[PDB]
Amino acid sequence: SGNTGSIINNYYMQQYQNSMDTQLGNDWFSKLASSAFTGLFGALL
Amino acid sequence: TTATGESADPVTTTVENYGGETQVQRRHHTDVSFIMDRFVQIKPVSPTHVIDLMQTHQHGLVGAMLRAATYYFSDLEIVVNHTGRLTWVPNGAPEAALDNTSNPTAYHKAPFTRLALPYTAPHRVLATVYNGNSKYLAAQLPASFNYGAIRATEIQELLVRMKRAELYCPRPLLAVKVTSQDRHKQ
Amino acid sequence: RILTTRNGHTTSTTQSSVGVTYGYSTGEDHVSGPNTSGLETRVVQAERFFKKHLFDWTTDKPFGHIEKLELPTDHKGVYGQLVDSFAYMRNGWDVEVSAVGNQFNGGCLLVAMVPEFKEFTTREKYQLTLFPHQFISPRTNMTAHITVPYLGVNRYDQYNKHKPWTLVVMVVSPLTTSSIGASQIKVYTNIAPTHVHVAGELPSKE
Amino acid sequence: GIVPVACSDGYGGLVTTDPKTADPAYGMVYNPPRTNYPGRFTNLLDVAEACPTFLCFDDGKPYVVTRADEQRLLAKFDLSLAAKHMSNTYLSGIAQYYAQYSGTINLHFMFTGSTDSKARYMVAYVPPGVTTPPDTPERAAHCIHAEWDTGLNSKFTFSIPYVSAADYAYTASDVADTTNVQGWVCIYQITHGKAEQDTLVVSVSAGKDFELRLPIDPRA
Amino acid sequence: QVQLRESGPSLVKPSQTLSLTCTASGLSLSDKAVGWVRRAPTKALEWLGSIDTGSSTGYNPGLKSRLSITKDNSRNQVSLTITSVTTEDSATYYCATVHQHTSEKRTCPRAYRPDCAARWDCPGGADCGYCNFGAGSYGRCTPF
Amino acid sequence: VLTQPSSVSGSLGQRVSITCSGSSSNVGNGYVSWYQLIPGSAPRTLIYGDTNRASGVPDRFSGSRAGNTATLSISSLQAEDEAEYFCASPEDSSSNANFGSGTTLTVL
């Protein structure tokens, strides 16, 4: 994940370590960087 | 074995020449990743002191065994006996950002702080001898030859441990000068 | 035991060879690196041999009289032009040292290529054999051939700022001259740069 | 008997950037949901290379206007991310916190001029250990460089390569004379068609492979 | 407003030892030293060497063989001696007030400082070492 | 050699200038003073040490400096200010105090 280098099932539950996440029913600046037109516009030579 | 001699091609005569036989060799203690894994104290040390090695004594077990190789790449392990917060910066960083308390900063503990900082210089493998004209004597190894700098208030002792060391291009090791007496006699 | 080494369009033939001593490798390492970004172009016209004079092997010279040559040395040839026009380049040193001897004069001369050469304290001269090296003796072989792969802290090193390989010749045994033998043994070299890659084209003066 | 831990004296204190986790003192809290919230960026380079920002030039302007006389050298700067021209860009803003960078740097020039005024420019990446050239020919079919003629598409992108000895290069250049660890990058106007008081806005981005490493914290 | 005077012979012959002297009296010419100058006709500025309290005379090399001075403090008078005048050497002799005192040393480079090298390389003649961690112009250290 | 202009002219009451132009080796580490030189007759310092003047100076002449050159300021140009004003700035190549040689100060 983040900086965390621990290699073990952490002691405390996720519920008590971090705050849980709700959902309703992404990463736009990577979609932008991927969608970028690389290369040329005219005929090479 | 009456070899060509001049060819300097490696020749290793066994003891099987005079009817004696060659025994079993267990060469662990003369390994490279093993002989450099011990702690080599750096003296004298003070605040705003770089953790770059070669400041190890030339004659120490880890100083001479290191200067016996031109190029050496290893992961440094530090042990510092400081008196305040000990800030450490990577290989290339402004000496101004030395104590911003955002760079790894080990808070003073009762015993010396022991860190395992990585090898961060941009080069492939550092060098013990550079033989290079002054960038843009020879006393000077490039500034990027360090493992980063530490600045605690009053640093009292500094030890250094080269993990996973790799030495290249061996050099002279130069055992102690003997004068008049046959053996050194210590 | 003849040996016809040939670099580029120039070849050297010796009839007293004693073999070739590759130092630290049998082949050069990958010439493609992230720093170059595939902008490095190999030059095959820089492999031509060049002859450089070395200290004369007088009888008076004592053991330990090292006469190192910095590599790369000033070059007025095609290789020299590349150093001037290219910021970064890498090559194999391939130093060849031949000292003509009458063969009736007995002496021992050790030629070794020392990477990152540092002035010796005269106690490391005995331990100077731990490098790619060959021994030049009039009794056995008058020519010593050493091939060394380019090795440096960076994949490409600017030659003007720093030189990785320096050729050093040491008088292991003082030359002894018989009446029949040569009274002085000049020493010459045949260096050739091998696997010359260049990158970073520089601006011009023309 | 109980377990004999035999705790080591040497380590166990607080490193600021250590990989550990704190001890949860508050019971579970379900924060409000934010699914697909617009505008999330994960890596600072996927944002830096996504949106280029301008450079600073004479009198603090983003563009480099056409020279007033024979002078063809419009503007030049060192490649170091700590250059004066790059002091206001986001790329150098995030490269401030990192120790050393590597790989490419795309420059974006977009001619902002009338339809009646054409011009033909040239950017040339000049390599370390040399003094950057006054006339455009000194750099032609020398170094790595390009040329673009303003037409219907104004923008032109030139990917300044990463040619250096070391695999990484320090971001904050500390002297080394005029030159930084990397070389210069100069922009020439080889011929302006009635292209006076007509500008060339210069931006800068991260390369397709630009990477920073070794985070650090200097007074910025 | 220290009391100065320029003095000497006015109508003299060329090719002799200029023997022109002044009286400079307040402290601004007594911790500071005496000045010797003239100006040539329809030309640019001219300067002649001068002496502080240390007895250390010095002159411009242009006429070194035919320039020589001394200093006196008691009579508030100082002496000038310039041999072998030429016709081209014509100007006003009235100024003798040389307030200027020498001092010379150059500060260190953009990243370099005095003992901020107390770290990488410590022993030697070049003391002003190197500060910011990283490759520097002279990363180890330098002399002034 | 130090540098200085050779021409000055003005009217009564207005502010005319005097300047002491130099360079790195002469001005940058050398103080500038200005002095009242009549045909044949005595001088007196006006501004000295850059920051001040002595008891005994009038406030009609004043000094300013900038970078590798210096300047004077002549407030209320007077018939008393009808003398050549000279100055010096130290030379470190031969250990001296290089002078700027003063002008013919004609009052209109």
Residue numbers in the entry:
A (entry chain 4): 15 to 39, 65 to 84
B (entry chain 1): 1 to 136, 153 to 202
C (entry chain 2): 13 to 218
D (entry chain 3): 1 to 220
E (entry chain H): 1 to 144
F (entry chain L): 5 to 112
Any passages from the paper?
Foot-and-mouth disease virus (FMDV), a small nonenveloped single-stranded positive-sense RNA virus (genus Aphthovirus within the family Picornaviridae), is the causative agent of foot-and-mouth disease (FMD). As the major antigen, the virus capsid of FMDV comprises 60 copies each of four virus-encoded proteins, VP1, VP2, VP3 and VP4; VP1 to VP3 form most of the capsid shell, with VP4 lining the interior surface. In the current study, we isolated a NAb (R50) that neutralizes FMDV serotypes O and A. We determined the cryo-EM structures of FMDV serotype O (O/Tibet/99) in complex with B77 and F145 scFv, as well as R50 scFv in complex with FMDV serotype O (O/Tibet/99) and with serotype A (A/WH/CHA/09). The final resolution of the cryo-EM reconstruction was estimated by the FSC 0.143 cutoff to be 3.90 Å for the FMDV-OTi-B77 complex, 3.68 Å for the FMDV-OTi-F145 complex, 3.94 Å for the FMDV-OTi-R50 complex and 3.49 Å for the FMDV-AWH-R50 complex.
The interaction of R50 with FMDV-AWH is homologous to that observed in the FMDV-OTi-R50 complex; R50 makes contact with FMDV-AWH VP1 and VP3. In FMDV-AWH VP1, residues that participate in antibody binding are located in the BC-loop (residues AWH-VP1V50 and AWH-VP1D52), EF-loop (residues AWH-VP1P94 and AWH-VP1E95), and GH-loop (AWH-VP1Q156, AWH-VP1L157 and AWH-VP1P158). The antibody-interacting residues of FMDV-AWH VP3 are located in the GH-loop (residues AWH-VP3D174 and AWH-VP3V175). The side chain of R50-VHR140 extends into the deep cavities and contacts AWH-VP1D52 in the BC-loop and AWH-VP1L157 in the GH-loop. Residues AWH-VP1V50, AWH-VP1Q156, AWH-VP1P158 and R50-VHW120 also help stabilize the virus-antibody interaction in this region. Additionally, the small protruding structure formed by AWH-VP1P94 and AWH-VP1E95 of the EF-loop contacts the residues R50-VHR119, R50-VHC131 and R50-VHN132. The side chain of AWH-VP1E95 can form salt bridges with the side chain of R50-VHR119. Moreover, the side chains of AWH-VP3D174 and AWH-VP3V175 form hydrogen bonds with the side chains of R50-VHY130 and R50-VHY138, respectively. In particular, the mutations AWH-VP1D52A and AWH-VP1E95A enabled complete escape of antibody-mediated neutralization (VN titer > 250 μg/ml). The novel neutralizing antigenic site formed by OTi-VP1V50, OTi-VP1D52, OTi-VP1P94, OTi-VP1E95, OTi-VP1L159(or AWH-VP1L157), OTi-VP1P160 (or AWH-VP1P158) and OTi-VP3D173 (or AWH-VP3D174) is highly conserved among FMDV serotypes O and A.
